[PDB]
Amino acid sequence: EVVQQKFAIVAKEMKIDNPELITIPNQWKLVQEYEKKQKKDIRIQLNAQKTGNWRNAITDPKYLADLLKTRDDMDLLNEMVVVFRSSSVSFIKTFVSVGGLANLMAIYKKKIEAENSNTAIDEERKCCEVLRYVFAEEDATVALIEIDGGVELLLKGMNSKRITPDNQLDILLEITLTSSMVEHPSQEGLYLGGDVCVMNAFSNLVSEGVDMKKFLSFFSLFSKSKSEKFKHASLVLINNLIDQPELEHRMDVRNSFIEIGLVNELENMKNTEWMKIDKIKDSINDFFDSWEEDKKEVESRFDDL
């Protein structure tokens, strides 16, 4: 009762970067409450098996995962918003570890494709809202890479006319995270190829005939969007896709983007208030700086032939 490291558990469990802002006496109170709740949750589950308030039974992450194989309704979706937004790190880790995401993704497909109605826009949007909470957990992005048509589904979902600019952002942020996750973030030498995962999903939109050219619908979202979080995030994705180890592969990916109006798009932003933001100025510079080095290199190889 002076230690007081017994809190660093609650800290990382609740995603708190700076516990130095909590008075020692308070984070003892919080520890007792953490322990108290772990015990509370236990009692509700063993009890709601008969009550039977499923609302309390789904405070078991495993139970929640299994239920989605059978239930896909507003009530459940609303409750999941509460649960995923406000639960602990480890509750999502468990959910995901037991399927969970693939189950929620399936429901999301159903929602995305459902025939128009009033309840349709909302049902789809809750999905985005719920996914936006699962994806705050790294294990979830790892799981996504291994779901056939997961990233593709996000790409399609992102092009829905039924969602909001904010929905579209959350999905993009999840795609971008995926694109950069070549290696498992918390395991030394384990390849995951999310970069290849996303690349393939963009190739699949072309070959399923949804994009007339590679990258088209993403790029066209990027182009008219007015979020500034979205312009930035879009730039980060583009640069990641172009950032390949082999010149052949950069020259190729970037050509696809040149082919659909990228260059003229950025050059217009340079004559625009957009450069006032340092996150975006640097991404645009990076693109050009990398394009130019590649020209020199190409010129340099031709010179030796």
């Binding site: 609740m14 308070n26 919080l30 937004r85 406000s86 602990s88």
Partner: protein, 164 residues
């Protein structure tokens, strides 16, 4: 008597608590992370034990706010009357949350910063709060200002009443 205070960032929860029991303001706005203190209130011919749990409005502390809910008798659902957005969030974020974690609590709907309510403006009205009180099943809707010292006692007298 356990009373917990929830609502959006910056609607005036901290000020509500510290004005009720100090009774003044912290001058410097510091966003709440967690706070908990008791305080004795003279009401009727007897004193009461008020355990106050202040919570974080900010999204950053979403996974931690539930640590404040156990055994709560009353929850104060707070919005600021000059901030429709906070008002809307009561029924999309706050109520659903405490209903999920501590459905046994009575709820008082609290309209904060009344001192700032301009007219001709899209602000929230005593009518809208009273109505919401009806839909949400709160015990009461009570307007207050930490700055003009209004409704303060009223708000906390009610938390006690709905328990006796």
């Amino acid at each position: 008597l356990k009373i917990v205070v929830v609502g959006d960032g910056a609607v005036g929860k901290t000020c509500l608590l510290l004005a009720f029991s100090k009774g003044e303001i912290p001058t410097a706005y510091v966003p709440t992370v967690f706070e908990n203190f008791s305080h004795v209130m003279k009401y009727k011919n007897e004193e009461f034990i008020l355990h106050l749990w202040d919570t974080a409005g900010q999204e950053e502390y979403d996974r931690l706010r539930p640590l404040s809910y156990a055994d709560s008798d009353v929850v104060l659902l707070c919005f600021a009357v000059n901030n429709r957005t906070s008002f809307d969030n009561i029924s999309t974020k706050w109520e659903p949350e405490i209903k999920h974690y501590i459905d046994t609590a009575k709820t008082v709907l609290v309209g904060l910063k009344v001192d700032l309510r301009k007219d001709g403006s899209d602000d929230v009205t005593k009518q809208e709060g009273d109505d919401l009180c009806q839909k949400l099943g709160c015990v009461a809707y009570i307007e207050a200002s930490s700055v003009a010292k209004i409704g303060l006692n009223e708000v906390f007298e009610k938390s006690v009443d709905c328990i006796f």
